[PDB]
Structures are given as structure tokens and as C-alpha cells.
């Protein structure tokens, strides 16, 4: 009944990757780090005295066409706990190794030189910065999202898939078991994988559980309408786990609509109405 009207909803919205929120220590190094080392565009930044931080957006084009990075300084908050489920940002570019030697040049940490990923053939390297999150840097050769991925460790990468299916309406663009390894990914999202952010979610053979930190926040996620799109959550997460936090709304008196829960690992996801979300770009 409510599963056919669910996949119909899934269909008819368009949604989008907005930004990963995610919390820093030193709000000035980050920037100079992602302008210098990694190419990325300050698109905004908010000083809010009132609530005791400030943001910065930052990203490869504006936020109404692109994914962006969502950096929170809370005053006086120099460290956060990045934990062990959180994986990484990825950035697509056409030469890793102009990107790695750009990285080192500009005083940035390389941690995995650039190459081939081990038992494939695309280019990677990784980066890490200031606080500790690492950027996967990868090979690609003419992307209209360079920021593409946001990678989390899950515990089941099955009830995951299922989950981020029929919760989000994303599609499974890629599932790679890696016996050698011990490890298996997929890519869910909402375009082909080479044009679009994706979320790549690892499971490692036997890990079932993992620290979600207090670094990174969540993931923003744009809808047409974030009363169906909660309705399509709410039923995924009666069948495979996860949480609604904040029912589908709009904020007081700025009349800007969200909803917001966890998946079935504890991974925060937002939903905001698409055109709502544009009240703040500027
Ligand atoms: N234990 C790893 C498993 C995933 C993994 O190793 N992924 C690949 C890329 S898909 C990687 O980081 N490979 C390192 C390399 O190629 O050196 C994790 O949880 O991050
Ligand atoms: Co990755």
C-alpha cells in the first residue's frame, strides 16, 4: 500500500546532495587548507554571537549546483573526536599527482601517495587535514562535482543498501567486495556515480559497530518535500532501524522546512525542502 506510494514519491522528487556539516577547530587554517591545498572555493561565511559559532561554506561551485562542506567552529572548541565510523571526504580531479604535489608544496599532509588503489586500476591518493579528516583524491576526468563522495563505515552493508534505498530513494550505483581486504563498499545516490556526490558506505569483514565521533554532524539532503520524503523514513526505519530526530517542518519563524534522523548505524541525515534551502544562499 504505503510501499508502492513510497517508490512512486522516490520517483516523482528530485532530490540532491546538499553539504556535509561537520565541526573544526580552527576555522581559519581549514580555509586556508581547502583554498591552497585542495582548489575549494569560500562560498560563505556566518559569524552567529548569539548561538556561539561560526560557519563556513566551501565547495567547487555555488551551493544552489553543488555539494559543499559545511565547516562549524564553536568558540573555543579546539578538537573534536573524529571516532572510527566516520570514513572520508573524496575530491575528483583530472591529475592526482598535480593535486598530491599541490597538497605537499603548500605544506598540506599526503598520507597515501598517489597510484593505482591496490587490486584496481583508478588513480587514488589521500590527504588529511587539520583536524583529521582524510580526503580520498581521485582520478577522473572531467566531473561536474569534484567533491564526491562522503564515505561511512556501516556494520551491515546489506540492511544499509536496503535502507538508503527505500528511506532516500537512492539508487545502488556500485557494490565491490574486496575478499583480499576484508572488505565490501557500495555507492548509493541520486545520479551515475562519475557525475554526482555518492555516499560510499564500507563494511569491514566482522566490525559491526563503530564510534560516531562528535566531528562530523551529518549529511544535508534536499527534497521537494520533506513531509513525504519523512513519511518514506519513517516506514524505512519501522522495517530496517534508525530513528526520525526531528519530524518533517518548518523552522520557528523562518519558515524554512526540515526533517532530520539516524540510519540504522546512527549516521544523521537532513532533509531540507529544495527551495527553502536557497533562503540562505547569499
Ligand atoms: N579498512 C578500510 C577498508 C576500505 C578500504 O581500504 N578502501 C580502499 C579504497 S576503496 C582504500 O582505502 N585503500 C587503500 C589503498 O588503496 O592503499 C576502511 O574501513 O577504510
Ligand atoms: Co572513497
Known amino acids: 500500500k504505503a510501499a508502492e506510494a513510497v517508490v512512486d514519491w522516490h520517483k516523482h522528487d528530485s532530490k540532491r546532495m546538499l553539504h556535509a556539516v561537520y565541526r573544526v577547530g580552527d576555522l ?42 559545511e565547516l562549524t567552529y564553536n568558540y573555543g572548541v579546539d578538537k573534536y573526536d573524529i571516532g572510527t565510523g566516520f570514513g572520508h571526504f573524496a575530491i575528483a580531479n583530472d591529475d592526482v599527482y598535480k593535486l598530491a604535489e599541490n597538497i605537499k608544496s603548500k ?24 583536524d583529521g579528516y582524510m580526503f580520498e583524491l581521485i582520478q577522473r576526468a572531467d566531473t561536474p562535482e569534484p567533491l564526491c563522495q562522503v564515505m561511512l563505515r556501516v556494520g551491515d ?5 536496503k535502507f538508503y534505498e527505500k528511506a532516500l530513494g537512492m539508487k545502488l550505483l556500485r557494490k565491490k567486495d574486496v575478499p583480499d581486504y576484508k572488505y565490501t563498499i557500495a555507492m548509493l545516490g541520486y545520479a551515475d556515480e562519475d557525475k554526482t556526490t555518492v555516499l560510499e558506505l564500507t ?3 566482522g566490525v559491526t559497530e563503530y564510534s560516531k565521533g562528535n566531528a562530523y554532524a551529518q549529511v544535508a539532503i534536499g527534497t521537494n518535500d520533506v513531509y513525504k520524503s519523512a ?14 530526530l526531528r519530524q518533517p517542518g518548518p523552522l520557528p519563524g523562518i519558515n524554512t522546512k526540515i526533517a532530520s534522523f539516524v540510519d540504522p548505524d546512527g549516521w544523521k541525515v537532513e532533509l531540507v525542502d529544495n527551495t527553502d534551502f536557497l533562503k540562505e544562499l547569499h
Do not use: H, W
Not at 569560500?42 to 555555488?62: H, I, M, Q
Not at 605544506?107 to 587535514?129: C, L, M, N, W, Y
Open 107 to 130: 605544506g598540506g599532509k599526503i598520507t597515501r601517495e598517489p597510484g593505482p588503489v591496490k587490486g584496481g586500476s583508478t588513480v587514488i591518493a589521500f590527504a588529511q587535514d587539520p
Open 203 to 205: 563494511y569491514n569483514y
Open 157 to 161: 552493508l546489506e540492511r544499509s543498501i
Open 231 to 244: 513519511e518514506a523514513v519513517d516506514l524505512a526505519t519501522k522495517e530496517l532501524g534508525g530513528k526520525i
Open 28 to 69: 581559519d587554517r581549514t580555509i586556508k587548507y581547502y583554498t591552497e591545498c585542495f582548489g575549494m572555493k569560500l562560498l560563505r561565511k556566518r559569524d552567529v554571537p548569539d548561538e556561539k559559532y561560526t560557519n563556513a561554506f566551501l565547495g567547487f561551485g555555488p551551493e544552489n549546483t553543488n555539494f559543499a562542506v
